[PDB]
Amino acid sequence: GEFPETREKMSGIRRAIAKAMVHSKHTAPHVTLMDEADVTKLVAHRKKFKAIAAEKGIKLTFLPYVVKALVSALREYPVLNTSIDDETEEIIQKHYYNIGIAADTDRGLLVPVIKHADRKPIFALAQEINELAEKARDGKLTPGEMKGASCTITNIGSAGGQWFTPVINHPEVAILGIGRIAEKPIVRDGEIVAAPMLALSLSFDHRMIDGATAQKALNHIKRLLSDPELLLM
Amino acid sequence: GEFPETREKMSGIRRAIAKAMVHSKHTAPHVTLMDEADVTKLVAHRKKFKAIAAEKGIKLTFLPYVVKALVSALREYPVLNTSIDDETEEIIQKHYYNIGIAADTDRGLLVPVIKHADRKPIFALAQEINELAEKARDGKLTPGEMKGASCTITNIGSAGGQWFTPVINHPEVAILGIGRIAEKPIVRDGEIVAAPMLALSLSFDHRMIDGATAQKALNHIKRLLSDPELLLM
Amino acid sequence: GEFPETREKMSGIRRAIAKAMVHSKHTAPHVTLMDEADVTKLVAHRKKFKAIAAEKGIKLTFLPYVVKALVSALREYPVLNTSIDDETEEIIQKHYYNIGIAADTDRGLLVPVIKHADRKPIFALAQEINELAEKARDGKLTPGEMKGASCTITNIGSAGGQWFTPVINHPEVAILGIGRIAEKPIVRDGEIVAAPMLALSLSFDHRMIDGATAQKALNHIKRLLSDPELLLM
Amino acid sequence: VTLMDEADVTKLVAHRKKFKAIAAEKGIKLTFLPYVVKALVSALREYPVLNTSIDDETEEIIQKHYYNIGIAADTDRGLLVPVIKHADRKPIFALAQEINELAEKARDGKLTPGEMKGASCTITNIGSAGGQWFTPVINHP
């Protein structure tokens, strides 16, 4: 009659999503670190190879560089490859680099995993990433492709946004959020110049990783993204 | 004798506040999106009509524009008008636009609600907002005026501040926080210029609204606040 | 054979850390305020007295100024000196200024406390801070030196970083996080200039301290850090 | 059959130079060989016949599906060929480090016999002694 409302049932998809979210919410205290990287060289580098990738049928995005930077951080700061179950003798350290890429789809939140990301080049990752993204979009993923990540990267940047506070998928200890790239005035040396900056948000499980360690891992990533040639070698 | 301490009882007001806060804290995983809007045109527009409002006995603030921008987002992204109770057949979608305005008072946190905000002009909202604010300040609100919101806006900006992390009032799915407006160097086109920026913080319930959707809703709001004429039409 | 994993026991140190963290995570809804202070004068002031401190065997850092600014805020906004236990007649107001300084060590998170911080000068604090830091690093702290804080300051800035989201040590109502200092373009008066900015992150317990109060306390701190002479007098 | 040819390496020289200091800080000596190793892996992948081997019986055409590259060295013990296994999964700095370690092991006779086996292809450097266009003997397998 007035202030109309429509009632709907949670059982179709919402209940399934909530069942997982209601566990993640009290898994651990979570801490997020908000920071920014200067990506001037990254932008220039990706641009330089954009045409080449196109000739090969590969679309470059910045994500493949982020994936490589994360693998490097995971190697330097090995605590990030750990996972924790609830029993006492359950601290697990992985010795491989499997990186999940989150995607928001009509089926909820899916996370395809690139296994052995440590052994792939940038063009190969770009191709695998694009293929997994399409499979996720259409619901064509094999369940075994959504398992085994040591860490996950969540892109919000494709929708715009900065500094969000991603939820750590509960079996892991950290998730890296990626925001948009946009020019901002920065001070470089003695001058105020504009340069593209990438908003980063790192979320970690406080029960295992402390503040200084997480920030150091983030600093590692920031340094590599700002200079792709060192990242590649 | 030394390191003196005074003991007081929680039962006067603190217990009542805590009773509500201790439920909200574990209602859902919450995600906040921190971002900024260029409000150069908004500032100029409000200024232009400041004298007119004064003649009519109306004080303009930026909030009436925020309220209109939120209504527009609520309409474009209808998931934001939903609410969830704990039983399975409890997903409720509202078909009206009732917006709560939070206020910090000596009686705790009050939220007067502007009903049918979708049918009001800017001057009318400014007048209603100011009246509700006074009623809240003095404790003169009728309980029915604090009910029925589809969404709430929390201003911290009147006290200064940026990017806070508002608590979603548990019956709803999102809350919009508003920070201060201040000039910052920005890069506009090819030049570094200063312009007033509004700090925004959007908090949403992860069990229903995903990252991309919340950011899109926020982008909608940012676009409208940056250009009030489109917002009005 | 493939995707190797190593299992380890949580009982050495991790269980102890988790036992505390798993309580703090659901103690209260926590709200963080992210903001920035212009510290141009602070930097210049510390520099001016750097040589003097060195002659006396004292290393100056910015922390002693932060400690004084916090004491001042604690005095102006006395709610910050409170603590809460879980029984009803447990609202405790302290009438002293004991400030904890957090440190990330190989023994987990330690918090030495400077008692009666309100009666110490900057050089004295710098000396006490450095001594406590060394004792914490080596595990030489007396347990009574880790007790009695009214508030805690957490530095992440020594590792780089901005805007983190510190966990309030559960017995208290607020924690102040300190990020790095770095120059950023700012607009000052009518010009775009660069100046060192300090990233601040204030985290508070929503059951006792509201948004406006916490922001006002933060504004107090920001004003004092931007002008050390007023802070000293 | 030998094919004698020449490559313009202006960019290669400039690139190695750029990262020389970095490698030194990490305890890594860069030479051009790590780039040659990567270029060879790429060729082996594009032209897979190069990963084959042949034994003398008829049903002995073997195609490898991995990239193990031998690096020949002339030592006082004769010609040794340490093998970098899974060269396809290593970065330049890592190869430079492995190459230098294998070279030292070969020089001192400290190689484990299993480190001299499994190559799909071998690279022979004569360049360290000067020289152009030599006619290397294909290790028969």
Residue numbers in the entry:
A (entry chain A), B (entry chain A), C (entry chain A): 1 to 233
D (entry chain A): 31 to 171
Please give sentences taken from the publication describing this entry.
The HIV-1 envelope glycoprotein (Env) mediates cell entry and is the target of the host humoral immune response. Functional Env is a trimer of noncovalent gp120-gp41 heterodimers, which are generated from the proteolytic cleavage of a gp160 precursor. Uncleaved prefusion-optimized (UFO) design can stabilize diverse HIV-1 envelope glycoproteins (Envs). Single-component, self-assembling protein nanoparticles (1c-SApNP) can display 8 or 20 native-like Env trimers as vaccine candidates.
